[PDB]
Design a protein around this ligand. Structure first.
Ligand SMILES: Nc1ncnc2c1ncn2[C@@H]1O[C@H](COP(=O)(O)OP(=O)(O)OP(=O)(O)O)[C@@H](O)[C@H]1O
Ligand SMILES: O=C(C[C@@H](c1ccccc1)C(C(=O)O)C(=O)O)c1ccc(Cl)cc1
Ligand SMILES: [Mg+2]
Ligand SMILES: [Mg+2]
Length: 285
């Protein structure tokens, strides 16, 4: 039942990471297209990356929602590891922020709403992402989001009612103050990253930025940031309710059933939440 490399015709390289190459592939027997992420066992072993490979598989195996890249299958051979993933034809959200410079209110609202919807699902499964950022929000052919990069995600244990996770992972611009100061992250840490992303969609850069990670950390823990002129006022209010140092006071932490109160923020008044993945996204310009 396991697939094999010879079951596919490989095409163009879609991208490369420090430990991986993602290649477009067609499955010969079905003609379906997949993005196949390929890792070298020897390199994974040397760089102490084995647990991250199995974590990526295990976490993605739990997910089945329209706003996440889907893992269809895994396989291996003597030298390589392979993940068969849904192909996000339009690549990274980051590319669009850089090219256009920022998003208008309608586009900011729409994409923010999809990310909220996605996080409601993920956190509902007791999973925290921990590295949410525009590079990890891919876009499918229809321009809906496809969140990726789960090797540094964490499944919180239901059995122990686990709320906090202890591994130090993330990206400096988006890392939460609690991870820096208390050395733990929780679901709310992903809400901090969301606040940074919303700011970035509007302002064109994330709110804590510097040419050195240490300089960024110092600003995060002091909540040292400012809004530009013209920043959509309801978006500013929302960001101010997410970029809160006390992780227990970020909008969405009211209850554990959903993100009802966050969805109810005035920034989202015109949003129809139920069928977001079937709506036509607004054009990015
Ligand atoms: N399902 C996919 N569809 C289309 N492109 C993808 C897909 N998954 C990854 N990519 C692109 O492939 C590249 C490599 O992704 P991968 O997860 O292998 O490493 P990464 O997270 O970018 O690197 P690092 O491990 O160094 O952080 C990225 O540019 C990503 O945008
Ligand atoms: O997790 C697996 C194998 C696993 C695997 C995980 C992720 C990607 C490919 C294979 C595989 C299996 O357990 O049968 C599978 O799921 O088919 C693995 C990880 C690192 C190294 Cl160096 C070797 C193996
Ligand atoms: Mg990534
Ligand atoms: Mg990755």
């Amino acid at each position: 039942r396991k697939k094999r490399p010879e079951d596919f015709k490989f095409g163009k390289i879609l991208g490369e990471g420090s430990f991986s190459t993602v290649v477009l592939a067609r499955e010969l027997a079905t003609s379906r297209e997949y993005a196949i992420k390929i890792l070298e066992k020897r390199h994974i072993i040397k760089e102490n990356k084995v647990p991250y490979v199995t974590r990526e598989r295990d976490v993605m195996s739990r997910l089945d929602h329209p706003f996440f890249v889907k893992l269809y299958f895994t396989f291996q051979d003597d030298e390589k590891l392979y993940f068969g993933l849904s192909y996000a034809k339009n690549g990274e959200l980051l590319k669009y922020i850089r090219k256009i410079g920022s998003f208008d209110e309608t586009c900011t609202r729409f994409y923010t709403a999809e990310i909220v919807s996605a996080l409601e699902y993920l956190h509902g499964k007791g999973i925290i992402h921990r590295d949410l950022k525009p590079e990890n929000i891919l876009l499918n052919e229809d321009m809906h989001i496809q969140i990726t990069d789960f090797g540094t995600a964490k499944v919180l244990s239901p059995e122990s009612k686990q709320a906090r996770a202890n591994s130090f992972v993330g990206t400096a611009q988006y890392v939460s103050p609690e991870l820096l100061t208390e050395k733990s992250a929780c679901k709310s840490s992903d809400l901090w990253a969301l606040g940074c992303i919303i700011y970035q969609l509007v302002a064109g850069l994330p709110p804590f930025r510097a040419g050195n990670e240490g300089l960024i950390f110092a600003k995060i823990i002091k909540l040292e940031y400012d809004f530009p002129e013209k920043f959509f006022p309801k978006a500013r209010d929302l960001v101010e309710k997410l970029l809160v140092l006390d992780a227990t006071k970020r909008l969405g932490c009211e209850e554990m059933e959903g993100y009802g109160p966050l969805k109810a923020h005035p920034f989202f008044e015109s949003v129809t939440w139920e069928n977001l993945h079937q709506q036509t996204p607004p054009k990015l310009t």
